[PDB]
Enzyme design. Sequence first.
Site, mmCIF file in Angstrom:
data_model
loop_
_atom_site.group_PDB
_atom_site.id
_atom_site.type_symbol
_atom_site.label_atom_id
_atom_site.label_comp_id
_atom_site.label_asym_id
_atom_site.label_seq_id
_atom_site.Cartn_x
_atom_site.Cartn_y
_atom_site.Cartn_z
ATOM 1 N N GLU A 240 0.796 -1.113 0.002
ATOM 2 C CA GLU A 240 -0.171 -0.007 0.087
ATOM 3 C C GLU A 240 0.995 1.304 -0.183
ATOM 4 O OE1 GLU A 240 -2.305 -1.137 3.639
ATOM 5 O OE2 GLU A 240 -4.408 -0.779 2.177
ATOM 6 N N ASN B 85 -6.505 -2.724 6.548
ATOM 7 C CA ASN B 85 -6.672 -3.028 8.024
ATOM 8 C C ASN B 85 -7.958 -2.103 8.270
ATOM 9 O OD1 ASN B 85 -4.467 -4.474 8.699
ATOM 10 N ND2 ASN B 85 -3.400 -2.837 9.289
#
Lengths: 281, 281, 289, 281, 281, 290
Positions: free
Chosen positions: F159, F197
Amino acid sequence: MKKVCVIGAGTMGSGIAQAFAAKGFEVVLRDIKDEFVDRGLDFINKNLSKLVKKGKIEEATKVEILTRISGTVDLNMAADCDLVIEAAVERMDIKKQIFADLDNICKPETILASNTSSLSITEVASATKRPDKVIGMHFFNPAPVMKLVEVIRGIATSQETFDAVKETSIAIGKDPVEVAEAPGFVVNRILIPMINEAVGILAEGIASVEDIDKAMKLGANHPMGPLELGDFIGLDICLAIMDVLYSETGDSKYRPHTLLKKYVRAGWLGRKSGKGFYDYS
Amino acid sequence: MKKVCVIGAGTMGSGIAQAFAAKGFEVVLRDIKDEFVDRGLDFINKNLSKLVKKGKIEEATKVEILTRISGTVDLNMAADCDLVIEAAVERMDIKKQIFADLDNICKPETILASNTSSLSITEVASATKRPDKVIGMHFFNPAPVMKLVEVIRGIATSQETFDAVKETSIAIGKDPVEVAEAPGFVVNRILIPMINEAVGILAEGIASVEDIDKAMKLGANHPMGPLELGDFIGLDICLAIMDVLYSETGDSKYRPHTLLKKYVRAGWLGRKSGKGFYDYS
Amino acid sequence: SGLVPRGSHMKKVCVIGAGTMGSGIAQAFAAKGFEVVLRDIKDEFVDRGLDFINKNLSKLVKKGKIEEATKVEILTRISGTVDLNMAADCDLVIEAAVERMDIKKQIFADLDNICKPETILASNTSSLSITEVASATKRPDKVIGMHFFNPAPVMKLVEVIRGIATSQETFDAVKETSIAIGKDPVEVAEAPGFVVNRILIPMINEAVGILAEGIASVEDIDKAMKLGANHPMGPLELGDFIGLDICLAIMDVLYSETGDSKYRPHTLLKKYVRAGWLGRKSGKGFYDY
Amino acid sequence: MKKVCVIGAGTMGSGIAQAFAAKGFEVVLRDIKDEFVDRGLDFINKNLSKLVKKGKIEEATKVEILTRISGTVDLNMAADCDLVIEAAVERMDIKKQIFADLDNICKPETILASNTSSLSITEVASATKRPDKVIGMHFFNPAPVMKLVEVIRGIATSQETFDAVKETSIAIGKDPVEVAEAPGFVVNRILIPMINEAVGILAEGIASVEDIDKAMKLGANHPMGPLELGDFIGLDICLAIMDVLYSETGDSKYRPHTLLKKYVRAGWLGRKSGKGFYDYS
Amino acid sequence: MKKVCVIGAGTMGSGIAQAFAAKGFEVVLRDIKDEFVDRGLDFINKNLSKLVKKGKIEEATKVEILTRISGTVDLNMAADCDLVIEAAVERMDIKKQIFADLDNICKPETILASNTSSLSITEVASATKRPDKVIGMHFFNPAPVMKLVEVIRGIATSQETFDAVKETSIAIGKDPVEVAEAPGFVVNRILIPMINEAVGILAEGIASVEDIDKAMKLGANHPMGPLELGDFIGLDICLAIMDVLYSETGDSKYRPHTLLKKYVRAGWLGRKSGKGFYDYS
Amino acid sequence: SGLVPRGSHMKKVCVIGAGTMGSGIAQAFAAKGFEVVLRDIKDEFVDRGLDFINKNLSKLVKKGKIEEATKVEILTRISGTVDLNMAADCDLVIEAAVERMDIKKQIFADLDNICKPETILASNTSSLSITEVASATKRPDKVIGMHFFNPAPVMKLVEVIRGIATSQETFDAVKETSIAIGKDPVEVAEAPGFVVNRILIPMINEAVGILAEGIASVEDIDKAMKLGANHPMGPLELGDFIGLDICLAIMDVLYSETGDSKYRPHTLLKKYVRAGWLGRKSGKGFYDYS
């Protein structure tokens, strides 16, 4: 865009018809019963009068403008228009019908706009087969005088449509802003919750209504204080907008204050009823 | 009702001293080192100067004003005063010591006041043995000009302490409002969340910052748009206030926006830093 | 030792901390026949606890509730000390110290090493995690909460707070000895507020919110709950009685632990606590005293 | 005040009627059918019968009392009363129509009161032309015995009206508290969330129903534990009140537990069903 | 357990019917019209045709299976069934109506099951005089293939009823999990908020739809990304489940994103309409 | 530098932190032909890191994914050091140190002074603000998040977290290099939990809430997610795998940043963590491992 049909001859719709004809537009004007139509145009006349008298304009003109407006009940007078603007009742099942009709009455290049401030432009546009040409044109009261229009884009509203509506808003001397559909757009979303905060402070005995307004007028250099503004807009109007924010977002953040609920329930809506947070006797 | 001490020679304290002297009060000005004291008397020298450089004031009551304002570092120099005002830094451990000592150093009649925006008057009063005459005097930058004063009553603040400070606020040409301690008093409590709301509209791509500010100006008749306003106040200050609202109330309603945190984290704090929601050259 | 009721296998108790609650708890055990070790840090503090128990027992001989010769026998079963090592052979230890996770962990760490393997270690805490404290030891199956109510010698409820690791055998033993000292134990899986405080303090907090929006006066709030709900006390005077600082801290814990705004303390309650108007103990709360 | 009319001859209507009659007031007890009136009269007869059998009053006192109560199905019989107390079903459109007829039926002096626990007094008051004379009088079951009444001021309820209703409350041997209209007034506002919190503890397996109730009984010195209390009030009623708190405030804080919903949906409402949190076999 | 009735010949109903028939159970398949029953029988025929075409089953096994299925419009034909599975009406009042007749129609030992995801089983069981025998049986599309069944116990569902539905879930080659009635059970309760969270990330411009989905396929090893999964399920259904979770729990945590709402309002529902977060043109 | 894929204009890479992730990141670059500086504080930690890499590669050799001589070649491209100055000429620095903002700002501020103007400075942080860290340097346009997934040599996703001042050029260079080492980068504007997440950890938290209310058992909760959503692991198992303390720390952060109670960590997750029942790595969480 040369010809405009404004649907609903109430305070807002008739204000919107004025604003347009006062700028050279051929204006159709529909409502549901000749009575309503007349209340409408009779409403516009009174208004021009006040201007002619104030010498802001010349009777010669008022007459001229009033000849550009053509009252009606035949929905079909819109077929011809380049832009339709609905300022009917804040009720979804009806807007959907008016819009599904207009989608059929009108030629294809017509753009169908709505002045709604609390229904989903996107959802209305789903009633038509031209959602690319459905949009929101949110005026402000009183429409002939107020500069701002929030142009509300549905998720399906095309750029061509936005651009043309934006252009037109300028042709008639308004100042449009671009808004993606969300609860309360820009102005209500920010302004009304500020009024709701003011009633929350009052309710807790933190300060009085006059000191709250004064603190805001003097502290943030605002023209009117929140509670006052509340009474001026109408507390029922304020309550219903908070309700919409709460219901659309689902966020406690926007829950209307319990005191506001009480004032409204008492019919103490502010100026339009002689009583709100202040007394108008 | 005549002699007035001021602690803190930053922007706020210095402006408050000026505002007092300007009306014919004997004023002390205390800090923890001459740099600051001088640096502050210096700042006053200019605004007063910038003033006599227009019709604003005569150079007689430039120099007549600076006569009444005597600066020291001798906390003990407050002992005489009828009213004291703390404008030092927003740390509570410190404000309590500042206030305890002053509790011993002064004459029973001396009323103590803070200009804090975000610390509890009540908790501070608890450092002293004269809570009955502890109060908040919240001024608005720039102090000499801005007329509003939020008089913040700690819970133990006596009505006599309040009535005094009210009278002496009008004395100095200000326009006080009575506020009972609660997070953000009135102005901040209403205004900052309004800024916070505007960033939330920006964050979701609803409107652009130019349009948001323009909608609030034309739509609500505000002198500044909220994003511009936040840049003007300073975004770090805006965020610290929302932090305090959220922290004090425990209510999610006042959570600072996530984007506002990112701006502050970049040091893009508004005008004072050359960049905020707007770019300042 | 045959003076200890047969229902409780455990026969010797160490109480750590000789404040109000700690003295009270030692008294409650000693009164029912247990040998009790009462520990604190300074002799001053222990002696302050012993003649607090004395003062209490003295009060009972005077109302004809117990005989003077019985008081003496009870104080005889309580041995003060500062030596934490005296806990070594005790079957149960109840810590009633101050509420600091880090101190409390040290005590339990110490005790875990000092005390024989079978000893059960208990805390009387209201607001600290039993499970966390148990993790500072090598016998978390023997760590448990035992929440007493002031005054400990009178109040019959014990909120037995079971940790995620507390074993059935450890709960079973603490339960039987709670009964054996004439208490009425309830079984609670660790969670914020246990039962009583979890329900009870938000009640007080709700009341201050009503007060704060001017719905009712404080007299009328307390009157309404007493007559309407048949409560022995009104929430506000009860807050004043418990201590408003104590109430706020409990609501702070409920909000902190749960992360739920439901349990936010009222702004007005913070403000009274900040003035130092903590209720009865300070002479002023929602009522003047 | 001398003549009182009670609308609704259910458990509360009848109990209220009896408490008035027992203290020397003339009472008109009205309902929509004879069988209901008869039922409430029967119910009153029995309660008094107990008190005689229990040696609390004499057969003589009981016939006096019954004599001061007149039954009827005609709302017009209220025309003449000083006080009408409404104890109908908790439906707003209905309470409004009742109060609107009463407005026209009763002399101008008649005060109109509602025993409602969850509808807005202010909103009810607004269906009439005597809002100054509409008020809440909230009695606790069982009404003849329970001393407390919550006097609920709507926002336009006059100080005169409150004073009369209070004097009258004292005069039937009750103990009145003044409450400005707010969701759950004072008692349900504190009490029912307490019960709802208890179902939450149970739902998370923290403690058993017996242990929870016992903890509250011994720990807080309460006469009943919250769960057995919920069963006694009725779980459906407990849920409806949580529903009202949450709906009125808009605050998640008062959301009813999910398990309480499930019990009610099962028809396990407490004592009245043979089953709630406890079994009553 | 041997004879099963399935009410509803739509997609799930006939899937569930096929699942039972394929494993040797007699099945009665009921809908309100021949039209609908035939449609469902055709649908099952096609599925079993696909399976013979890919040699998963013999064409005479296909025949055996269809032989085990009788169509009907008459609820009365559930009379001697050991298990009835309702799989139509996502309307509570109609579900109660159906369960109420089945309760009169069926031998006492018949277990009555719903395939619903959103309506309370407990509430449905209450419309019957056999709530111990009412249970949720929640299947996954496509029913003949997906192995999981969430077996939902109303608060009054008995162990015996649970055990029978478990053992017969297993006998049709499925894998049951025991779920106490609560909003969204297990799967939807976890999965749909995942999707709703993805849309919030998209709404804030944090990532693009493609990157969000890529991040979840690679980062969490999910077979599909949350946004394409939403398209595949249908955004109208995802939104309705979130509506239920919020509605039932009263917790803001489960509020559906404003943007998901806008999509469903547009009729961009995902795969089934040619457009959702992706274009399927 | 001829062994470095041509798609990457960056040729020299320094990793800070010889822990699990940092040394996995080093290995991922080195295996693709980059020269890597691996820096920690004490020789002892570097050696732990180098030995970790050695061990991973020896498995690869054991499974026949690579040859023994390739393993030794790859290790030869990784240079252990404690001298933070070895970063000065590197084109990219990746910090994978402890999750502490004060320490992190210091590192970044040192690197800003040490390194040439062109060096890009990246953090592998999953929880601290990139933008705040960038503010401790005079090159915020060159500061960026590079979030890798355990184990970094194998997990393809990274990411890429743009702080508010992160430049397009810096992002473009990180993306290129990411692709060059065989990864698949996604563009993420800084927000709490980024993408993965943000979505994944609340899933786990929801499942502990289901378990806490007796709605279903752990086995059934996980069975239903695997069968029902076609997930390869159920959420409680997954919690145990990631570490319950990591899961809790991510919710804490989600809740802290957003201020929205929507992300409050479940009371029972707190309790497991407090017990030391952290999952696989402690022999116990929601499942017992043995």
